[model samples]
Target chain A: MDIEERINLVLKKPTEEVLTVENLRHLFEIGAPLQHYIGFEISGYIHLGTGLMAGAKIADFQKAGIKTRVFLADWHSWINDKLGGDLEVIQEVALKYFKVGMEKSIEVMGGDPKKVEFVLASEILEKGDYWQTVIDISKNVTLSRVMRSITIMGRQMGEAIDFAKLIYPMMQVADIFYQGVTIAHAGMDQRKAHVIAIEVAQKLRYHPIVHEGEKLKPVAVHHHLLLGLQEPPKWPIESEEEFKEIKAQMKMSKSKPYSAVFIHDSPEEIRQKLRKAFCPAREVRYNPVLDWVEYIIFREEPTEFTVHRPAKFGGDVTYTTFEELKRDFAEGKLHPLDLKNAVAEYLINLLEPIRRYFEKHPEPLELMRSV
Target chain B: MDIEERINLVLKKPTEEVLTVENLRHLFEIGAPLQHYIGFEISGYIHLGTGLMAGAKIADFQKAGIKTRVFLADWHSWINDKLGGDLEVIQEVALKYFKVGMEKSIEVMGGDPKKVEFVLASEILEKGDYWQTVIDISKNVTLSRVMRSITIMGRQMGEAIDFAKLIYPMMQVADIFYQGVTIAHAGMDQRKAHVIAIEVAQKLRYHPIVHEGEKLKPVAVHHHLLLGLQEPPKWPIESEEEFKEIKAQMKMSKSKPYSAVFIHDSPEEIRQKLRKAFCPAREVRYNPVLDWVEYIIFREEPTEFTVHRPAKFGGDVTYTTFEELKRDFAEGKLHPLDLKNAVAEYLINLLEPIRRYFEKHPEPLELMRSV
Candidate 1:
């Protein structure tokens, strides 16, 4: 593959935006093999948001010939009060359940799991200048900037979060530099922390890669976030800003079980959850079922999407493209129930390999359940 | 020595308060060796407040049979933007100049320098669970609590300090637990950080010394802070609270060179600084000269303090006790200049050994000057 082809692969469907396509292009043009990283806090069961949405982008980076890595943020999870705020249990689950799920997800998303590197935050933090790097990064940013960066932790300071949570953003930013990652990847909500990383990288004189005698800023690649299966806080959002706020709150959350479709969730559970999902008719703009189809189902540009119906209503219809599906949905040609059923089936099919992997190796999932 | 005598030594003149005299008595009664620690950021020249006021207490702890240690806070200085905010210079100055200055001060204050253990923040922070302890401490405290604790850094958040400065208080608290310190000592301003340490010690399950199968809360011993030579922000303080507010602002500082008497000052420089100090006539309260005479000059209970004057005024007089001197000054029998000159002379004589030591070994001082 050529440079243009690799860039296209990296900027594919799930990738919302490359912060600076110029920097990313320069990184490729320089002919240096780039390192990519995405971090996950070991909070709960791996859902489609953590698995498919993020893993798809990791696969894309891998296809672009960037060395992909996943950071299991055990300490971050501990700080966030995950797994009963028990560090040992968080690490155990992260290594056993989360790491395996991510690998399976990547493999399912068409990337060789064996080629990707798996790292535990504890391993890097326990040794080397990791904490020093965190402090150095923190020294460059002010209280307000860090307060603004809390969104990466899926937190708002209005809850009056702990000081440890504040450290979370600094550590998250440091992980990019410490791991020698050039392409820092995460869902769109994590852009704040990556922005902080960009702001500090040059000031701290920390750069993993030097191109043409100049230090390179880590290129941030943000992926699209999947909406939760539950209803939005406010339906028929009044403005784009309101819709965005609703989107953040309505993103697939592990705290509410039905709000997220777990990669290992049984077919019946997936179907049941989707049947109750909030998908209003002709609402392609805020329709989560349409979101699934555009970002996940046809993420690989599938030839066709089929929605089954009774003989009375427009039999079985096929969507040759996501645009065609959205146009039909906007015109009320596709009903909400038909879209939900089709999305549920596609999710079940897409997550089959991961479900099988867990079935074959059930100990991690069992441990996660107990935890 | 009996327990009462040892306790008296620990609670001597410069010692303001031991958080709980009951805890101290119990620790002494149990006959377990207690570890004492005081920390300092490698900021600037070691003045009388940091040297004599703090070192005198350390000497008292040593006399009380507590193992004394001094922590050179290099990383903290970096965070506080000390020494040009150059980490290398701060660390270099810490080991060579600050460490030597502290040892000399301790020696001059009647403690054996060889008996005291000196540890660098970088040395402890580079390895082991120091950062872990910091994070743990951070987890137990709220943002407001930490903001309140920032007074340990001689800072209030009104200036809107950097995020790293917030981390300073947590690390300060952790130093108590991480260094196995039982008697955590510092000036009165540092009581908040010590209070934080006491609050989190049991919660984090960190106990350096267990007495009779019970975890011990670190006994906090805060010493009196010396008044700066500079004039108070408000001279005629109306209330005790206002006096306290002015006192905090008027504490000896290194930022204003003339505000503090540097431990290694020449006899002429000492006289010049003290002559310019804020000392009102007939004023026993809110007087820096009287503060020094009570806290520093007679800290070890000198037999007599002699004030020399010309024949035109009251002749040279010798006072046997600080109370007698205070009474005379209150009666307007002692002039402010006469008191200032006498105090300066006493300081010059008292710090002769430290001055001699620095003169004999001038490399560290030279390095400090260049830095």
Candidate 2:
């Protein structure tokens, strides 16, 4: 099915009661304005990975008749722990990467730019009353609640720091409530903050529809967790003999040098890297290219492709499509080199528009210069 | 020394380093411009007690060259806590009592009616930023530091209601700072609050001097547990034993009615009450009239008769002064009835101007209505 059909099916019986597609559609149809609000940092190039996901999601939501509010969360980005509260750097990044990301999203979603409203949190802070309200709301929540938001930690608990770090999540939560959002859209990591928003609504006695459902109960929201491309890690070689042998050698590290391909990587670099990636027979170990395809490209279904080797080289494999290629790999029929080559071509094709768009758009390239 | 010479002496060598009388006089000499300043209130009638205190203090300060900015703190009084939070009844009291108190203060202080600056705290509250500095200052102090302030609870530890109640000492402290005062003047009961003010000034790194001095300080500020003015139950009446018993009774109930004269009582009432009051030889048990004379009126270093009786009464004691009366009483030649009559006449005479002023002004009369 197409993206719209798949979304419709998912909404028909949403995973959570609060986010039923039927109710969302009804609200949209009735002019309630389904707002899919998300905050993004503007300090770096929009990596193709993030770009593709953002584009696809925006397209899906817009097609479903949802209005979108794209906040630059510029102030938040400066204070982002990873960024070390470097506002100047973040601003540079936003002007460069963020603008490019916005353009890319607009192109992919095929929607009017006017449909999306952009705001900078920094501007809001300049308003004394707004700042006071932020301070007031901040005082109400305990420090502990802020520290516990895994989503605010970016799914890595070790990264968060300071009381202000905890407040970042609350600020985002307050944004939704303050802005009167009907629906909050974020990647899976933001699920926790959205839950907080729901609770805030409940506590404040604001009767916004939380979930989309037949009961027309409290407003239900939805969270979509994008699965990571890499296969789960392995630990402790089962046999002592095997472990000693593996330990004696220079074991390949999965996270080193080219394990992940950023969106800004050149086409030649992409092809070269994919060719060298490891894809063992029927194994998903350390093969980044194929992982991306499996998790993102063919996310909900399977596809097939046949591998052709020169007569002098090892022979032909009968695979109908990329999905078949995955199935063979799972069954131990497909060899690593064959899968790697197929993934490289597919990835090149998948990322072509983003690459071309950036080539023509000088902003993101200029942004990359400073970083 | 005369009062002015004594004031000059203290001003020349003001004892407290944090708050010297010279510094207070100096600031009072140069602070603010009276022509542009004004005062306003929305509450109760102005009574003599508050009038006398505030009037004398402000007048002295103004004479020393300070242009006073005296708002009713009406808005503050309206809020229950008068500091951080709100309470309806407290605000009501403030609104009901402010006009009376303020007018009386202005009148008694010899303030320029045109120059006295007045505005309701409610007006400032409506402006939004009025308490921003106060809140900011409050945020800097920890809860523990606020609790430690003696002025926050005085000796009434059992009466403290909440953290806000404790923090109110700081609000009064902030008022001085907020007023931009080089010297803050208040009654001695507010000395504890001024101590906090000194600390706050040090913390905030300002150099304002806080002065706490009043006429009643040396007497009223004393912590002696005086006897109650009521008869001791009769046992076997040895005169000495009865005297001891009555003295003990007087000490137990000094704060009750008839213990001292309230400024609000009528002259006729004062006379009747004094006539009915207990008085005896120098060692009498329950002598309200005598206690008032000894503790209140003739409390100075060279005590003299606050009330002098004519010679027609027994013993021909032509006492023109408290010293003369004390000597006669000590010699066992003075009559208690003569002393009471004299005291009654003197008290009525002393209260005449205040009574006429209050009756004509109606502010103090109105103040009594609310209380």
Candidate 3:
């Protein structure tokens, strides 16, 4: 189904009495064309997680015929470094990584350059007239609202920083006003800023188009919580024997980072990493490589494949593709070693293009090197 | 002695310790220039008094080869009106009167077009970067100093009005800085502003050549006062007879405007007004017209004309020239009527060019009619 149709279906049932499907849709399309004007604030290098979110958002918006605006919020980053206590070194690292991630996503998604535009916030802030707009918006919102919106305010009591930091949300709101966009597009993390924009628009008597559903219920564009290739810490089983077997197989830890595969990894490296991965019975409950291929690469049903180990009396197992192989392994029909070898080969083939592109374009590789 | 030598002799024992002989000479030379920069603040109609001051200041400044800069100070007038509770009317008045005053001063003084530049303070104030310089200077001075410098501040109690009013001194100071002048020229009433400018320049670390010495002493620029048309209030003398005589002659009622002859009056009108004026030679303690000409018109000096009035008319008349007449009058030999008649003709001749100019340019008259 198309994005609009999918959204309609998702909101068909009213989860709360306060909101209705029709109401959600109405509020979601206040300024129908507003959704086309998208803006991304990039202060530092994009991470894999950031890339995943940004790519998905850009792709989805592009599919809807929305124009995307990418802003390098350089001034904001400077302020953040100076006042937010964020380390400059970390910011630099993030910036370098972000560029690589964006390049990789561009190659993967193949976005049209005509639909995207880039701007730097520092340039706009220098204008007195523009800054006046920021000041006007800032006067509209309450201090408490801003404190709650900013994540750093969660840690401190909101009394420590300069007033400029407190007023940053309004500056962001002003940016939306100055850009003359009906719909402001940002990651789910920026939901609070969008909400503040709505309040600011209301106070300024301007009709700002917020594309989210009724009452600004931020839409989560992507999903998370993919586990590493490690055994369950507390295995759930009725039988004591089953529990003992599951516990015995568990080995990986979050601190070790033995399961996570980076986007820039070479095909050979991907194979090597997957070979060392712990998967038993080809079951993919915590198999990192198999899960990556099934969910991220194919976006299809999870399955498993078997390796032909003639010396160990293993022969070719039933498997049409990597998807089927992952499912069987998850269903406990295949050995873990056979599944790891098949998964490794499949991942190497899947990541071949990305690896070649990274090699050909040193930009992404250089970004990775800096990180 | 030449003008420079005379200035040095006068400055040998400077009237004010803050000024030096060299500085006094520079200020005097600077003050002598006409057709130089003219800065006229448009707060009200171009009254005859205002015209006279403008003509004198222009003539004096132009003598030193200084160009005049005429500032309308429309912004300051706007603020004044706003503070005084009639912003709309004041704005209208500013627009209407500014041109009227400017044109009259230009024509009456025969000001050089190239030498005169008009500025609106509102435009300058709107430029925050430029305005901030004024604010910065104001911040350095204590509120008491600013209050004392501004005459209007004396009317308000300590608690009333915004601190911005105190900063007006700085605005005047900024005008000097922006105008890039070696000397500041203003009337006696504006000596305080110049003093503030000097302080502001010192605070800002600029070595400004201030021209306050000439304007520090009030000139009888008031036409009615100069024409000996009005009798000012007299103090009660310790001598009972003198007090009685002075009180009897004084025109203390506002209804009796004939007690003063305005500069606009023709020679016949002046004679008629003088004929009606209360002047009783030997018995009266004061002769309004004669005392005015003696003390204010010709300054305190003995003149041959003062000895030329008829003995029966309270003098032995034997004056040949106007200068001799003024000398005798200064030496207490001339009768009050002879001095009044001679002074009237002398002033009429002095004002001939201005009268002719005003006849062609009737805007000043038209403006005063509205008032």
Q: Highest TM-score, which number?
A: 1
Cα TM-score per model: 0.96, 0.53, 0.41
TM-score of chain A of each: 0.96, 0.73, 0.60
Candidate 1 deviant stretches above 4 angstroms: A206-212, A308-312, B206-212, B308-316
Candidate 2 local lDDT, B257-344, one digit each (tens): 5544444458876777667665666643345555555533443325345334455645444444455666676666677777777777
- Please give the distance, in angstroms, between residue A284's alpha carbon in candidate 2 and its true position after superposition: 5.5
- DockQ each candidate and list the results: 0.57, 0.06, 0.02
**Alpha carbon lDDT at A163, candidate 3:** 31
True contacts kept of each: 0.55, 0.00, 0.00
Candidate 3, residue A75: the lDDT equals: 47
1 against 3, candidate with superior DockQ: 1
Clashing pairs in 1: none
- Candidate 1 docking quality: incorrect, acceptable, medium or high: medium
Residue B244, model 2: Cα distance from true site in angstroms: 35
Model 2's interface RMSD: 9.1
Q: State the TM-score of candidate 2 restricted to chain B.
A: 0.60
User: Least accurate stretch of 10 residues (summed lDDT) in model 2 chain B?
Assistant: B214-223
For model 3 the local lDDT of residue A134 reads 53
